[PDB]
């Protein structure tokens, strides 16, 4: 019923302050994020600057918390500028699956109804196309161009309009607000209902997530200035949050878009990557590989998942094959931010579990093992413009009703 | 007039709570502190337990913030148990020069008047001899023995009376209190005037000193589970606070009592030492020794020097010798958490540790003595309104 | 017919004195035993002190040769404190299988009927239950705790009642007695039949066993301050005597409780271990399982066995695999202390030895059946 | 004072018994002793065989303890055959300075009056000349020849005369005798009294010396099958006892004959030498500048001295120089066998005790008695009575310290 004792106390403020501080702190990291496919690089100090300027720009452009902005890109090195900026101001951000149907995108976007949309070069036509069908979508800004594209502004142009040459990110202040109430992200999944909906994620969810990535047992124990590999889609809770927690711990990131097979091996070997986070299919590819042994995976200290590899000893397959310690396992994870109670190689902080009282509602003891429920500040505050599914998923007094006994 | 923007926000809580979490987190670090002369080792987890138990024990024994405890030991690996425990509770701790004369010692102990005293085996006869002369000095506990010594209790014995086999430091909570008001340490040093006097250190001073050791520019940049070398007396502010800040970063510590430079290098090379904090004399020996090139100091990434301005410029010399980025330290001014204004990892070196003021520092910092103990007139002499200190004369700023 | 001329003359005194001297001699070995699962370490100097204090404490507590003490623990680094201390005093020790049923344990302890029992934290509940059934089992002491457990004392508490801060193991003397008559251990096996009997092992068996571990042909040739691996139960004669012989040679011991896996390989590799003694199953696994090749067994110079592997030439294979030419046979009767034939054995004759069982305990004239009227088998 | 508790209990039997077992044990050591000047090598097993055969031969030839044999050789790898054989049987051995004048040699030999003399080829002419003057010297045997030399027998010829092809050292038994009474060696000192005398060394002295060579604090902590350098004369107590204690420990010996020069610097590196023993003069030359920078401290773990060091404090100098944990200095006078004082691993040997020697009478004072001490001088009861007291104590030469 109570979880473990946090080894790092949750940052009391907003997610933006933690990130801002993390970027000011680790500014000296030159190999900040690298595009494995194009060898393009970005330094922490670049991101620091870009996010701060963009925050100011978003403000002076005239947006506040009652607004909502959106980003739509494939895994991209410039994904994080706008995201962190929105967190600075406290403007809720909505991520978008870069591979949606036109139909899907219009639905998804009709949930949060963003006034501003950031997107990649690659995604730009799609987004203009869709923008025709939504009257609320005022501005679109391209994230990986230094020049405007057919009248569509790029982040640089935009930011230039609102900040000068002498701007200093160090003299910048992120807004302050209740991290438990203020929506950081509005992410969208499909449930049993089969309708899109769209999930609210508070800042405090993120700062707790950060505690976890810091935990020496259930998190990463990798030292700063060390390369990790990011592959999961940044528009999923998995990819976004696992990637976001890279900055406060100060890790160098090498980034891969989709699978590509063995490319995702060339990369580990060649960048000397220490940790990898990966979904189950990647893990099974790891267990069962036609001559994986042609690459020198020797740097791979840590391996992690998020999708539950049911069994068939795949965690063992990967543990034994690559000389890596036990792999993070236990408990199946939900879209709300996923990671909840699990076990290293032994054989969750800010998280509770509830067992007593099938037809009642108050107890504090984990003895008999009846029905199970969850209460953490890291949980979705609910779905967006749909007060109904929020109550059906999470109850009347803050607990969340899981499913089994 | 202002210091650099803090790269890590100061821990809002207690100095003891930050240390508690630090020991909780880095518990896995074996070889926590190593006694270089005797290869005795204490693990982060040992220290966690012993500080927690001892904390409990001080409480049940009946001590609170209106009380005061003391420690007197040479650099000893068991030094930090009583110290961190006292920080856990909010019992003010007074460190003592293990090399005092009886008269000096009774003076020092008569300032803070501690009711309980922790000490080394080595310091024990002296403390007993001294205790005779003090009616306030009720209890003595030995820190580096597993057995009682002629009826004088040891930390194990004391702790067993009040804690069982089933004790879990993880289920322990340090007390909560405004870290800004509660005296952490009362340290002793004279100079001005002449009499000894006794300096007050609040908790948040320690918490700020912790952000400083964390700073990537003015602080250490070494990763946890890597060995650092501590030599300064733990009873002086420089040595204490420098050693205290080792735990929150998760550094493995190799600790040495006396100098005798030969063995010093033996240890750097054999323990693979990455950083050094050091007083000027050992710094000058570093430049001007032949034996330097007999040892493999190749491990020495970072080097630091407090305690003195190293007079002329022996820094450049040593930096070059031991192929280090250049060592660049500051003027620890007063017994107010030692360090206060340092030397940059990305800037001109000019002349003198002028540079740019540390975070949370203007002098007006929360890191300054809160005044010194029960002597209001000279506290008034040094510190006024709005809590400024202006002693060293001088007057050269130059941006910045 | 005779065995090879000894090379090292058997230490004429008691087994305890040879152990005392050996722990004194080394002591500088700071990594005496390591708990492979926990990195817990105890130095030869710690074992020296704790065995001397515990010895003393046993004496003042009031135990002598007419008594019997017992131990029940899984392989534990604190196992050898109680054991050597008894050996110091001349108190016979009874090792006990930590994995016994209550029924089995009660049988075993009813053989020797020890008045005092040492045990691990792990064994403690079991031992208290078993103690309920035995009127002779007066006291229990826990070995791997620095704190007392619900009124059950731990070795520190016990040695503290009877020794001060000022105690010096160097000024301690172990007792003297004809090592040839004084029972060191009472170990328990099934053999002559299927029922429980209890094997008497004299001090002089241990001193001869010590000779064997010293022999440059049949024993190890590894120099002190080098790591060796212990896996066998300390409560079987095999594991005990193999581990006891580590101290006089001054080897660092890395010890593992349960058998085994890749953790065994990781540890050989990471602790850089030079020798292994092992039961047939580990040999047959180390023959097969391919993981042998991704780990660095570079340092594994010597390998030994002891429960006849010669069944399908499994040794041949393993010798070749690792770069270790030659392998140590190992003959196993528990009654024969340890091994008595390998590629003979000094102080041994065949058709026997002083290293041979002295008989079964108290009233078991199965001894007459097992050992004849002029010492042979 | 009492000194330290022996970390190894002294072997109770004879020196020849402990040496016998040590050679059977370490038989497998091929590079047993090496001549640095000739690269000639002798294996532990060769010495095991040669000493056992030779003992048997000495017996059948008809010698017992009432006899006394002598050896005269420069540092020679074949030196230890006669010596260990004499120890096996309990025949007292008298080593002789290979560089004596005829006068001196006739004196030295007139002390112990030995019936049989082993010597090297180099020493043979000298010894025959000297034998002319002594009625008691019946036989001479050459130690480093495989052939007889003008009718003078070599060890081989001799041993063949008395043992066959089927001889097995492993079925050999050395004699049993009180290791406390039986003279092992009779060596000749330079007793500034105005006369040389013959110092008696019991077996028990040797077995104790063996204890010391085993002590992990005061002795060698180097593992078997490791090369050490022997340089001191085997006829001084220094060279003999230090060399002898190499066998029980199973060390490889690299040996150099006379003084040194650079022909000493070369050898450590080339042979990968781990330990060194040297007289004070060699250490004061270790305080010079012959670099010739051969990575020699890559093996030179331990260094030892003994005769009269310190002086200008060359200890520290040499210790920190080629990197040693502080070097082992050793006070002993030949009457003491070897060292009876020494230096640990932090900055009064086992079976050795120490006291103050009130000049008047006293016998107390405030802030040596060992079983390792000479059993007296030879056929000279008066100097014997003067050096060791009537409760066994012996006066150094000099108060202190």
Author numbering:
A (entry chain B): 7 to 353, 364 to 421
B (entry chain H): 7 to 368, 390 to 427
C (entry chain A): 7 to 349, 363 to 370, 391 to 416
D (entry chain G): 7 to 353, 363 to 382, 390 to 423
Any passages from the paper?
Although beetle luciferase systems share identical substrates and chemical reaction sequence, they emit a range of different colors from yellow green (λmax ≈ 560 nm), which is typical for common firefly species, such as the North American firefly Photinus pyralis (GPp) and the Japanese firefly Luciola cruciata (GLc), to orange and even red (λmax = 590–623 nm) from certain click beetles and railroad worms. Biochemical and structural analyses of the two luciferases, combined with computational modeling, provide the best insight yet into the relationship between the structure and color of light emitted by beetle luciferases.
Unlike previously reported luciferases that are exclusively monomeric, in the P3121 crystal form, REPh exists as tetramer, although in the P1 crystal form it is an octamer in the asymmetric unit. The N-terminal domains in the octamer core structure are assembled as a tetramer of dimers and packed over dimer and tetramer interfaces, and the C-terminal domains point outward. Only molecules C and F of the P1 crystal had sufficient quality in the electron density to trace the complete loop.
